[PDB]
Point group: D2
Amino acid sequence: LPVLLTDLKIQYTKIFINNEWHDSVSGKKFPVFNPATEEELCQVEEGDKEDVDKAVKAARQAFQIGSPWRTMDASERGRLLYKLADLIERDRLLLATMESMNGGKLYSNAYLSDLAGCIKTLRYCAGWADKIQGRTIPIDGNFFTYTRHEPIGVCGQIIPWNFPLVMLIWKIGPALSCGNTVVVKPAEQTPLTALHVASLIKEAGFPPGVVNIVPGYGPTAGAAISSHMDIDKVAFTGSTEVGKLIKEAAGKSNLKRVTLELGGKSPCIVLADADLDNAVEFAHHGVFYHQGQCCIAASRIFVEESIYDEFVRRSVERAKKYILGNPLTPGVTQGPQIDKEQYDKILDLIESGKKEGAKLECGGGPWGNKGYFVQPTVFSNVTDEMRIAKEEIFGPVQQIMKFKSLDDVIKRANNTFYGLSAGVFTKDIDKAITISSALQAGTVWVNCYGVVSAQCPFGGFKMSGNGRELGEYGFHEYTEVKTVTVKISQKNS
Amino acid sequence: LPVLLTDLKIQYTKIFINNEWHDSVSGKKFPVFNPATEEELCQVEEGDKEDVDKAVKAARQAFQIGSPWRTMDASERGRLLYKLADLIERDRLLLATMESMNGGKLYSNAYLSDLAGCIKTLRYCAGWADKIQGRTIPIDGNFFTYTRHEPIGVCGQIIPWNFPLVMLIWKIGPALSCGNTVVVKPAEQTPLTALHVASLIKEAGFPPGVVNIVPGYGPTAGAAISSHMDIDKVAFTGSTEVGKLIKEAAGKSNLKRVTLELGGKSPCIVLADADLDNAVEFAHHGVFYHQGQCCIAASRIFVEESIYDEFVRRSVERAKKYILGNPLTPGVTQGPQIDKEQYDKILDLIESGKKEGAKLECGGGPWGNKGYFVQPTVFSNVTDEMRIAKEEIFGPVQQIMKFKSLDDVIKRANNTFYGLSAGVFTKDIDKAITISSALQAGTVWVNCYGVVSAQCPFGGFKMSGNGRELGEYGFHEYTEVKTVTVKISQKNS
Amino acid sequence: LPVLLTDLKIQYTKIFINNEWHDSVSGKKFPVFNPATEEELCQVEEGDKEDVDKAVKAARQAFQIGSPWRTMDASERGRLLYKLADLIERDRLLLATMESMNGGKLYSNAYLSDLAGCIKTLRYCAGWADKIQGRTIPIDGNFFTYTRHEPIGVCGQIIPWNFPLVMLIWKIGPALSCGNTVVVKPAEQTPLTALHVASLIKEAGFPPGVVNIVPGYGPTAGAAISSHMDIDKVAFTGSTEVGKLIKEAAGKSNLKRVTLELGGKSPCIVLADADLDNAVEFAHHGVFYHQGQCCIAASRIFVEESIYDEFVRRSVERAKKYILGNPLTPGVTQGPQIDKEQYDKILDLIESGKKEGAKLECGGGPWGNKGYFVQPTVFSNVTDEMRIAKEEIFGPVQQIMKFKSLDDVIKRANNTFYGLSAGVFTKDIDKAITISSALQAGTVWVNCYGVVSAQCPFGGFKMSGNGRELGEYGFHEYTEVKTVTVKISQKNS
Amino acid sequence: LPVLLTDLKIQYTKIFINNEWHDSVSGKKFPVFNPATEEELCQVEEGDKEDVDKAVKAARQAFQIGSPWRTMDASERGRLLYKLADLIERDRLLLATMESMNGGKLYSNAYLSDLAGCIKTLRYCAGWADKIQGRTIPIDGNFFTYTRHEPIGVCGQIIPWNFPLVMLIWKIGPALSCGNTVVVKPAEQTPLTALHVASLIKEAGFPPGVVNIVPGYGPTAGAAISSHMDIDKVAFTGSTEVGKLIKEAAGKSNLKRVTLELGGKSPCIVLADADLDNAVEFAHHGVFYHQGQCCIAASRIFVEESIYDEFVRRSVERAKKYILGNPLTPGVTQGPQIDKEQYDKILDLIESGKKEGAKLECGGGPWGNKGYFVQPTVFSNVTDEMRIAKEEIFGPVQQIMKFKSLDDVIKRANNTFYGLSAGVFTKDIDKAITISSALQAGTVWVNCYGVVSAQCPFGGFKMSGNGRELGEYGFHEYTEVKTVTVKISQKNS
Ligand SMILES: [Cl-]
Ligand SMILES: [Cl-]
Ligand SMILES: [Cl-]
Ligand SMILES: [Cl-]
Ligand SMILES: [Yb+3]
Ligand SMILES: [Yb+3]
Ligand SMILES: [Yb+3]
Ligand SMILES: [Yb+3]
C-alpha cells in the first residue's frame, strides 16, 4: 500500500464543457467537505439549469453526423478509453487520496479496490467499442434487411456519492464505448474526483463536448438533466425515492430512456449445512463494507435455527474488532458516514431497532467529537415488520433473523419492493440452484457476497432498478437499434 | 379471397380471467360499434380497477415458482404458441370478418394481411421459446458466474384499435414465449377479436391465469394497469400523449418497466435519381394504408425540385382512384375512420391545411350519410411550420414538400420530436447508406415503405417510443437478467 | 404405449433423387435383415458412385441461385420442417415399428423416446430457420461491412445404424433449416426408416433435389460421398476408425468441410458422498441403453473405494433383471445387437475381460438360438490396461473400477484418445464444478447420465469428434460466412 | 515515414521453448536470405520432429488444469496481449526493417501497413479475452444446463512467408485470447520477425510454454506439427496444395481440428456504370500489392465490353509507373519476389500467357542483375481456359477479361475451385447486393478491394479455406464447447 508522499492540492473546481473550464452562469459556488473532520476542503462552481443547458448543447454538437466523435473508428473510441485508464493508473495515488479525503473512504480500499475497479472496468469497456454489432436478418420477401446498433445520443448521467469514481466509470465507460456523448452530474458531496478525471479526458484527447461535467445539486442540476428536452437518456444511481422522480420527469418531458440503479434490502439465507465461518465472514463484509454505504448491503441475514446462536456469536465477535478514525491513517478499519442527513437517518433507524424490541448485540450509537461516525451495530432477533428489516439503512447496521422453514424464508426474503441482490450459503447443489432461481434479485451470490466484476451485468429486480450495467448485456442500454430494409429484385439465402 | 358464408355471430363479450368468463365487478357494460354504420354491434363487460386487480392476482399466481407455466419445458411454451397459431388459422374467416366489421378494416386486407401477419408472428415467437439463453461469464477471481434470462413476471399490455389482432399478437407472442404472464386491455373501440382469441387460448391449453383479458376504457382500466403496484412491466401502443402518462404513472407507482410504441410523423426523401413510379406507389401506400391509421404513415414526403411536379401529378392520379364504402364489400378500397374523436381531429387538421395556405390537390372533406368517412386528401406546397406538417393526422391525408438541398432536407426530416420510421428513394449506393445512417428513425426503408416482418425489430427513436418489438432484439424487453456467482476453489479457462 | 394394429408392410425401397424413386444404375439390390430373427425383411436398391453422382447433381441444381429453395423465405423453410414433423408424428406407429423391426430396438423406446426425439428435434430446428443472422460490423475506415451466414451448399450426410431415425433428423434438420441441400446415405443395416421419411419429405412439399437419399454400403456409396469433388460438406456419425478415413478423403479430394461424431469410452466418477442409488441407476442406464449401442455409453465407472463394493453389488442386482427377446413384445427389456460383425466384436472383447483377469459378475456369453443376443455383462476389478477398459465395446458390458485419489482418477478418466462425454456423481458444489471443468469431454452430466436434448450442443473432444450438433452452436457448422465490405463516402457510428 | 537510424543487428536465431532459447536437437542450422540481394542474412536453428516434440510437451504442460495460464483471469490474458502490442509498437522501427529486409517488403508498407495491422489486430484480440462466453440453456426436463467455451489446447500454427508478422499475430492473437497454448512454425524463408516477437512475449510476462516458436522447414517441422498425436488443432496459411496434405495428415493421426487459409484466383466484375477511375485503381492495387504475393490478389478482372478498352488503357498506364529496387530505399515502389521457386513459377506462368495467345500489354520478363525481380505485367484478352486465368500466379501479373452478359460473367467468376474473395464495381444498389450474394467468395468488396480489418471475419469458400479468422466469428475456431447438464429437483423459467 504505497501513499502520496506530498500533501494533496485541489486544482479542478470548475464546470467542464467542450474541454474547457467554466464558471457557473450565476457565478455562484458551493462548499465541499471532509466527512471525517466536518471542515471545508474547497469551493466548487455551482451548476444549475443554465449550465446544464450549455453542457447539453456541447454534447449535442459533438454528436452531430460528420463530427469527429461520430466519424472516428470504433477502435479509436476504444483506444481513447484505454488511454484514459492508463492516465487514471498514473494518477492512482492522488485519485485514491482525493476519494478517501472527500468521500470518507478507507484509503487502503480506495487505492486497492476502488481505483483498481475503475481501471479494470474502463479497460473492459474499451474492449467492447469495436465489437458492438448489429444483425443481417432473413426477412420475409425480396428485401435485404440489416440493423445498426447506433449510440443513442446525449446521455445525462447522475453519479452517487458512495463510489464516486467507480460509478463515474460504470456510467461513462459503456456510454463512450458505444459512441454516446455525456453530461455528467457528480454527487454534490463528492464532485472532486470527477473533475480530476475530466482533466484526464482532455489529456487523453477526447473530442470536445464528448464528456461534460457539471457539478451541483440534485434538485437543481439533477432535475434539469432529468427534465431536459434534448437529453436522449438519463442514467441514475441513488435512492429509490429519487429514482421515482427521475422516471416521472422523463415521462413528463421528452420520454427519454431511463436506467436506474437504486436501493436494496438484500437478504442472505444461511442453511444449516453451510460452511459457517465462510458465511459469517461474507455476510459481515456484505453489510459493513464502506460503512454500510452500498446499495447491495446484506441487510437481512436469515440463519437456520440450529446454527443461529453460533452465527450471531461469531458475527458479534467480528463486528467488535473495528478501529474507527480518519480513513487516511494506516490500520484504521472504519471511516465516517458521508454527511449529516445520512448520519441522522442511520441513528434514527438504530433508535427504532432498540424501541421496537430488536436485541442490540453491540454498537448502537455515535462515536467521536467530530466526523459523522457510527459505531458498528448488530441487532439479533429482528422480525420482518421492524423498520430496520424494511428500510434501507445505508449504515453499519447488521440485522440477523431466524428461520426454520425454507419455503417460508424464501417468501420472507422476497417480501420487499427491493430486489437488488441476495446471498445463499449452502453445500447442497440442488439447494444452491433452486434457491438462487427462486430469489427475486438481480445478482445472487452462492457461498460468497458482494462479488462484482466488469464482465457481469448488475442491476435490480422490482424497485431496485430498471436495466443493467456492465457485462455484454449492459451495453444494450447505451445503443439504439435502427432497422434498414432495402428493396431488392431477388433474395437468396 | 374466400369469405364467411354465414352471418357473423358475436359470442365472447365477458372479462377473461383464469380461463373463465367473468362479469364486471360493478356489473356495468359498454357498447361496441361498427364505424362504417355507426350502429351498435354488442355490449361488452366493462372492466375497471377491481377487474384489473382480479386479473393481476390471477397472473401473479400463474407466475409463482413451482406453477405449471414456470415449470413446463420452454419447448412446451413454444408448442402452445404454435397451437394457438393453428387455431387462429382455423378461425381465419371469422376473425378477419370480426376485425373488418369492428375495426372498419378492408376485409381483403384483414384476411390477407392482418390475419396472415398474426399467424406468422405467432409462429415466429413460438420458435424463440426454447432459444432464449443466458451466458457463462469469465469473471475475475475464483468464481463460476452465469446468467439466467428469466421472464419478468406479470406484464400489463394495452393494445391499440388500429391493428387490434396483429398488435395483440405482437405483445402476447414475445411475452408468452419468454415465460411471462399477461393482463391485456384491448382498445375500447375494438375488444371483440381479443376475446375470441382468449377462447382459443383456453382451447390450446394454456394454464389458467397465464393470459387474462380485461376489456374497458383507457382512463379507468388502462390507468389501473399503468399504476398497479404488482404489475412488473407495461407495454403500450398508441398516442405519444398517453405514452407520456403511462411512463409518468410507472415512475409514481412501482417503477415498472415500460415499453412504448407511439406516434410518428415519418418522412420520405425522394431523390431526383429515384425510380419515380416505384416511389410514388410506395409513398402513396405508405400514407393511405388502413385509412392513414398507421403509426408509420409516410406523412411528410420530400421530393427533389426537378421531379416534384411530376411526383405530385402522379400522386394525385393515384389518390383519385379509391372506392369508399363498407369494408366487407368486394372492390371497395377505402373504409371509415375508427370513431368520432379521430374523425373530428382529421377534419380539423385538414381545415388548417386549407387555412394555412397548403395547396389542396384532391379530397379535403367528409363523405357519405353514415360512417366516419374522409375523402382521400392530398396537399402540395406544404411547409414545415404548418399544422399538417407537424402533427400526426392518423387519417388519409398526404403532404408533399419540395427540397433542393440534401443537407437541408435531412435536417428537416429530423426536425421533429417523432422518430418512428422513414423512407429513402434513390438509385445511389452511397446515398442510400449515408442517408439511412443520418435519419433519426427506428426503421428506414430504402426504395420501399411499410415493410414490417416478425424477424425485424421495430420501434421508435425519440418520442416515437421506448424499446423495440419483435426480432431477436425485441425479446430482450420481456426478460429480466439475473446474475449468479458461485464461489469455487479454483477456476480454469 | 399404443401399437400398430396391422402388420407392417414395407413400401419404399428405392433410391430417392429429385423427389422421384430410382432403381440403381447397376440394377443391383442388397438385402436388409431383422437382427432379432436373422431373416431378410426386404431388398433395397444398392446405390454406388453413379447413384451418388446423380444425387449430387440434383442437390447442386436445387442449390443454384434463383432456385425455389434458395429464394423461398427462411420462415417457409421452417414451415416445411414443422410440416415434416407433423407427418412423422402422424406416422409414429409405423415408423417406430419399422425402427424396432429393422434396428433391433425395443419398441417402447422406439415409440416413446426415438420418435419423440425425432419430432421434438425437427420442431426445434424449424424454429431456427428465420433466426440465423449475420452481423453489421464497425470496421476501421469509411466502409459499411456486413456478414451473411449463407448455407454451405450440398451436404453429404452419412447416418449410423444405432439411432437411424433420430440421427437422420439430427443431420437433416439443421442442414435444411440453414438452407442447404443434402445427399443422405443411411446405414446399410438400417435404410428403411430413412426411405419412409423421404416419402414424407415429398408429401410435405420440399422442392425436388433438396433432400436425396441413396441407400447402399459404406466403402462404396459412403466413400463416394466423402471423395466427391462437388460436395461442400460431409457429416458422419460412426466409428472413430471410419471417421479418420472420411477426414483423409476430404483432404485428398476438394477440402470439403467435415463434422464427425465418433466413438467414446466415456467415464463416470462416483464420489463417496454421492446419492448411491441415483448413481447406480444412471450409470446402469448409461451403459446398457439400446444394448450398449450408444457412442456415449458409460463404459468406465470409477467408484470411490469406500462405496465400491456396495456399488458393484447394487449394479449386479440391477443387471440381472433383464428379459431378452424380440423387441416388439411387451415386457421384453433387451433386444439383439445389430449384426454379426458387432456381435463378434462384443464376444471377443468379453473374452479378453475374462482372460486378462477382470472379475466377471454376471453374463459373459451369447443367448438364444437365433438373433444377435448378448447376455448383459458386468466386470468388476477392471484395470486401465485391459482391452475392455480401452476399446469401445458397443455392447451390453459394464466395467466398474476402483479409485482412492481424485487427482489420480481425473487423470485416468482423461487418459484416452476419446472424449465424447462423462458423468460426475457428488453432492458437493465445488467438486461438481471443478471436476466437470477438468474432464476432457464434450458433455459432462452431474448426478445424471445420457441426458440429450435439442437445445444443447453435443459432440466430442479429441478423437470422439470434430464440431458440434444441435443447440445454437451446432447450426454454425451448416453455414458459411461471407463478409461484404462496401466503400462509402463517410461512416458514422 | 521515420526510419531506423542504426544498422539492423540480428540477435534471435534460436528455437524458443518454455521462454528459453534452444539449439536444435540435431545441432543443425539453416541459412536465411535477403531476396533483394540473394545474400545470406544469418543462420537459424533448424527445428525438426525432435524439436517440435519438445515444444508440444512444453505447450501441453502450460495448458494443464491448475497452471498459471489456465487459472489466470481472462482479463489478464487480455492484458498480456495488450502489453505485447505496446512492445511491438515500441520495436516498430526494427520490426519493420527486419520484415522489409527479410521478406522483400517495401519498407513504407512494412512500417505503415504491416506493423500497424499487427498492433491493431493484437489490441482487437486482447479485447475479446474476457468476452468469450458460453450459454445457459432451457433444456427439456428438470436440469440446469450450461456451456463452457473452453480453449481447445495445444494449437500448431504454420505461418506463411508473405506477411510473416501480420499472419503470426492473426494466428497467435485469437489463440491466446481464447486461452490456448501454441507451437508456431514460421516460414523457412522468414523466421526472423517471429523470433524477435518471441523475445517480446517473454518480456511481456507470458507464462513459459504458452508460446513456443520452432523455425525450420515445411516437410520436416510442418509435417511434424500436422501429424503430431498431442496437438489438438493446426492452423495453416499457404498454398492449397499443402493445405490438402495438412488436412490429410490430421485425419491419419489424431483427428486434430484444422483451419486453412489457402490460395485464391479472385475475380473482380466491373459493370459499365462503375466509377471507372476508382475501379482501375482498386483492381490495380488488388493485384499488384506486395509484388502480387497475396492470397486475395485480384487476378481475374472482368470488365463490361463497352468500357473494356478504356479500362485496359488506364490499367496499363498505371502499371508502367513502378520503380523497382531495394525495398528499403525511399521512392522505390516494387520489391523482389520471395525466392527462386516462386520466381521460377511466375516466369513460367508469364511464358504460358504469351504462348497461349494472351495479349501482353507491358512487362513480361525479369529485371536486374540480382534479386528475384519480375517486371509488372499486364495481359489483356485473357480467356478462361488459359493457365494464367486458372492458376494462382502469386506474382505481379494482371489478367483483364471481357464480358457482355452478367449471368455469364457470374458463372465465369464462380467457375473455379478457389473462393477466397471477389470485387464488384457498380453504382447500382440492386446489382451490388445481388451480385455479392451470388459470388462464391468469403469476402466480397463493393467499389473497393483488399480492405481487411480485425473486426471482419476472413476466409475462403471451397478450396480457398476451411474456417474463418478474426472478427467475432473467427474466435469460434479457437474454442471447444463443453456442455454441462446438472440434475435438479425442479426447474423454473
Ligand atoms: Cl438487432
Ligand atoms: Cl447476460
Ligand atoms: Cl459474422
Ligand atoms: Cl453454446
Ligand atoms: Yb457534532
Ligand atoms: Yb353524421
Ligand atoms: Yb447362430
Ligand atoms: Yb540470377
